[PDB]
């Protein structure tokens, strides 16, 4: 039999879904509609997937969808539909945010655009509004180009809601030495003639010939609300372990979807590509008739500013307390190598533990050589490891790799004894 | 009450034990007896531990120990004993093992000594005997010295018993380009006038000013055998979860102690530093009246030759088949970064799986940026994760740290669909 499967996405989740259902059902007609020029060369045609780029979906209803591609407007039939249209920038409500000066760090075109622009009309000073992940990277990006950079965050510190203050402090310390960090400020508007000229906030004004808004992202749910799909308390599309929505045969994965936290169990929205990919993977499995449950996410994340790396996995102390846990914590400094081997950098680990179960609730790591600590910790968290379980986990050691007591085991010892 | 703890060791396992019994029971008399001049700097004297360097133990019995220190003998009483006397190099029974230019990489003076003989007597050609970790790490050394190196291994390939062939081949590939690798050759003679001149093997002869005997390590169970302590089927001291031996109130930890494999349950001998420190830690805790259990080890190992790192955790395909397991494996190649991002190096992963439980039995990794994978896999293995559990672990992602699908998740995926 045939079965028409239609995917409104094209990004990480859309294509993972597409590929899984195609490989499981070669005889089925799987299509992907990307409202854009990007994916992940349409090699996919050979893969057996009918990709349509710059094909925008403008109406959807049960069994069908209407897309406008190449001026034309055609409508397609579907048995199984998958919402995989990710998230989009959320523009702030400040005066004039559309002048030739402003740019948002999103789709690769902007990367071509924004960059090209600068590498044209000479741009010296550049201001970034946002103390989030995106903000920080763009900051690093520009400083590296020698351009003077200035960050504006309304909160008391950057990454204000993603990490606790003790991890952030190490980052801010380094950050302040390459970018002009302006906290507690609220932008109030941004004047100029044909191009952005100056940015003004309730504390001062700043020279600016390029501006980046890293003020936020929102799930692209409009098309789904049209199908009457239930959207979660988080603002993203409600979903179950199979990536199923409240409407029959309608799945949703990636940045549009709201998933569940593996630790707290409540619903969350963690728009990160690794999970998105798997979300699309199980959506496609279930569509093709093979049961597969997605456990949920840990909220794992990582980024960096120049050489100081920062990462988390699991609950933060803010989150853990917010959730009503009785927690004990620990914050330790350690080294990336034995204190003799050359190249040993510094590494800081924050640990949050459930005092009642001695269960590790979350770990935050900043400094150097973070990836090993957070990935191991994520596995531990995924398994419900206690402070004791982590201490006795047989991790690797060699002078060029790490110290006899891995920074993760140290934190564990310190939590256990507390 | 007064309890007299005596530790025959001084090494990692030894000090952990002392440091633990001492913290938990400040009032007890804890004495460590090192035959040598090194440990882990009597800051340990302030911790309350009565450390005795150059205090070689020569006899032991139910009530006392007879150590030979400072010309004369002395006997100390003990209510609790701990064998933490580690392991010694095992020399081949061949001609002139003691020519002035021959060494074994063990006790700290060896480093100073070897580097002295090399940094004094002009040394050009250095010969290494054995294809172990010690052999390979030593090659990387003299090779980086500009010195010419020739390695002799009697087996068909290096790390013949520790890693599967497809993993070691990558290593040998880099190895054959900086060292003269001589496989399947049994060393027979090492000759020279007063100092080593050459080495002769059943396949030829090589010239050497300095030779490294990295052919094996062996548990120092002699003083324990004297006390009737049951020694394991592996050759090292038998032990239980609390690091107790067959003799009452006698514990053992470190390279002398035989532990158990977490995945297999069989008794194994895995002389590594992290495990040792923990064995010693639980030995103490238990002597002090605090029940603690060491779960055993995974066999986690890591090492590297120049820029090609090689590691593992859990069973090897050889071991798995050896244990009667129904296995399916997978070997994949991947990038350490997104394949667009600059800096991406190659990384290889071999995974073993129980075809009946779908539980991961082991992971061997080779190439670049190894640590994050084998450490994460260690935790997964430590928890009894299936191919599917591993697939869904929330690992971190950002272009500077890793690709969207971590190579560990890629392996899981390939194993799962396997």
How many structural units, i.e. domains of chain A? 2
Q: Please report the distance between the alpha carbons of the first and last residues of chain A.
A: 62 Å
Helix/strand-derived class of chain A?
Answer: alpha/beta
Name of the CATH architecture of the largest domain in chain A? 3-Layer(bba) Sandwich
Number of helices of chain A: 11
Largest contact between chains: A-B, 50 and 52 residues
Assembly of the depicted chains: homodimer
CATH topology of the largest domain in chain A: FAD/NAD(P)-binding domain
Main β-sheet description of chain A: 5 strands, parallel
Characterize the overall form of chain A: globular
Radius of gyration of chain A, in angstroms, nearest whole number: 23 Å
The CATH superfamily of the largest domain in chain A is identified as: FAD/NAD(P)-binding domain
- Strand-residue proportion of chain A: 25-35%
Relative helix content of chain A: 10-25%
Please give the CATH class of the largest domain in chain A.
Answer: Alpha Beta
Binding site for CoA (chains A, B): 23, 47, 277, 333, 405, 413
Pfam family, one (chains A, B): Pyr_redox_2
Subunit structure (chains A, B): Homodimer. Homotetramer.
EC number (chains A, B): 1.8.1.-, 1.8.1.14
């Amino acid at each position: 039999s045939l079965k028409k499967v239609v995917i409104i996405g094209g990004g990480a989740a859309g294509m993972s879904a597409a590929s899984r259902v195609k490989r499981l059902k070669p005889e089925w007609d799987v299509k992907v509609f990307e409202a854009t020029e990007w994916v992940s060369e349409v090699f996919i045609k050979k893969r057996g997937i009918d990709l349509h780029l710059n094909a925008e979906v403008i109406e959807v209803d049960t069994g069908y969808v209407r897309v406008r591609e190449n001026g034309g407007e055609k409508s397609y039939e579907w048995d199984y539909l998958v919402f995989a249209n990710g998230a989009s920038p959320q523009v702030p409500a400040i005066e004039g945010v559309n002048l030739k000066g402003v740019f948002t760090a999103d789709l690769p075109p902007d990367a071509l655009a924004i960059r090209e622009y600068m590498e044209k009309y000479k741009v010296e000073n550049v201001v970034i509004i946002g103390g989030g992940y995106i903000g920080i990277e763009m900051a690093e990006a520009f400083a590296a180009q020698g351009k003077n950079v200035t960050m504006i965050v309304r909160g008391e510190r950057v990454l204000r809601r993603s990490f606790d203050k003790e991890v952030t402090d190490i980052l801010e310390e380094k950050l302040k030495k390459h970018v002009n960090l302006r906290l507690q400020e609220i932008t109030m508007k941004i004047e100029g003639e044909e191009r952005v000229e100056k940015v003004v906030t309730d504390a001062g004004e700043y020279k600016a010939e390029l501006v980046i808004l890293a003020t936020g992202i929102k799930p692209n749910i409009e098309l789904a609300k049209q199908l009457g799909v239930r959207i979660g308390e988080t603002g993203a599309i409600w979903t179950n372990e199979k990536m199923q929505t409240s409407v029959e045969n309608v799945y949703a994965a990636g940045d549009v979807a709201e998933t569940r936290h593996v630790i707290t169990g409540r619903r969350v929205w963690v728009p990160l590509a690794p999970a998105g990919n798997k979300m699309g993977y199980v959506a496609g499995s279930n569509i093709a008739g093979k049961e597969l449950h997605f456990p949920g996410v840990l909220g794992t994340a990582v980024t960096k500013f120049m050489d100081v790396e920062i990462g988390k996995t699991g609950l933060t102390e803010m989150e853990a307390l917010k959730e009503g846990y009785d927690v004990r914590t620990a914050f330790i400094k350690a080294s990336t190598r034995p204190h003799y081997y050359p190249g040993g950098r510094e590494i800081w680990l924050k640990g949050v533990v459930d005092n009642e179960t001695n269960r590790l609730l979350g770990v935050q790591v900043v400094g150097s050589d973070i990836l090993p600590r957070i990935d191991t910790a994520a596995a531990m968290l995924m398994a419900g490891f206690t402070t004791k379980d982590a201490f006795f986990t047989d991790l690797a050691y060699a002078p060029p790799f790490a110290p006899v007591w891995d920074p993760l085991i140290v934190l564990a010892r310190v939590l256990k004894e507390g």
